[PDB]
Amino acid sequence: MLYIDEFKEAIDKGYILGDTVAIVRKNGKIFDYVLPHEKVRDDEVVTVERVEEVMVELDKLEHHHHHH
Amino acid sequence: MLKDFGKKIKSLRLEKGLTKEAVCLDESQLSTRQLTRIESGQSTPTLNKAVYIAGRLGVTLGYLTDGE
Numbered sequence: 001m002l003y004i005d006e007f008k009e010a011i012d013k014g015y016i017l018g019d020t021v022a023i024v025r026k027n028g029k030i031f032d033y034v035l036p037h038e039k040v041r042d043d044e045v046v047t048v049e050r051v052e053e054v055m056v057e058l059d060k061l062e063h064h065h066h067h068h
Numbered sequence: 069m070l071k072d073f074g075k076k077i078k079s080l081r082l083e084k085g086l087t088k089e090a091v092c093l094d095e096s097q098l099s100t101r102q103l104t105r106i107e108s109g110q111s112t113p114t115l116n117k118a119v120y121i122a123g124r125l126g127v128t129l130g131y132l133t134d135g136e
Contacts, residue, residue, distance in 0.1 A: 001097060006111060015110060024099075032099045039101070 002030050004058040016051065023049045030057060069113045069133075076132050078107040080125050091124045 010016045015035060022034035024044045031044075033054075040046050081091060088100045097120040105111035106121075113121070122129045 032101060
C-alpha cells in the first residue's frame with residue numbers, strides 16, 4: 001500500500017533521485033517502491049516506471065469518487 | 069505521526085524479540101521495506117500504518133502517541 005504523500009516524501013527527501021524508480025505492483029496496482037539494496041520477493045512484480053507517471057497514478061486516489 | 073514514533077516502535081519491536089516480518093505479516097497494510105523506512109525516520113508513517121503497527125506490537129495507539 002502506497003499513497004502520494006509517502007512517495008512525494010521519498011522524492012523531496014532525496015531517497016528517490018532521477019526520472020525512474022522501481023515499483024512493485026500487487027493485484028495490478030502500485031503497492032510499494034524499491035530502492036537499491038532493498039529486498040524484493042520472488043512473487044512480487046517489479047517494474048521500472050517513470051516517477052512523474054507514478055505521481056499521476058497515485059494522485060488519482062486523492063480525488064472524490066461519488067457513488068449512490 | 070511525529071518523529072519519535074519510529075524510535076518507539078523500533079525499540080519496542082526489538083525488546084519483544086519480534087521480526088519485521090512478524091509485524092508486517094501479509095504486508096497488505098505495510099511491507100517490511102516500508103517498516104524499515106519508518107523505523108529509521110526515512111518515511112513518516114501514515115495514521116493507518118501506525119495503528120496497524122500498534123496492534124501488532126500489542127499496545128494501544130495512545131500509548132505510542134503518549135496521549136496526544
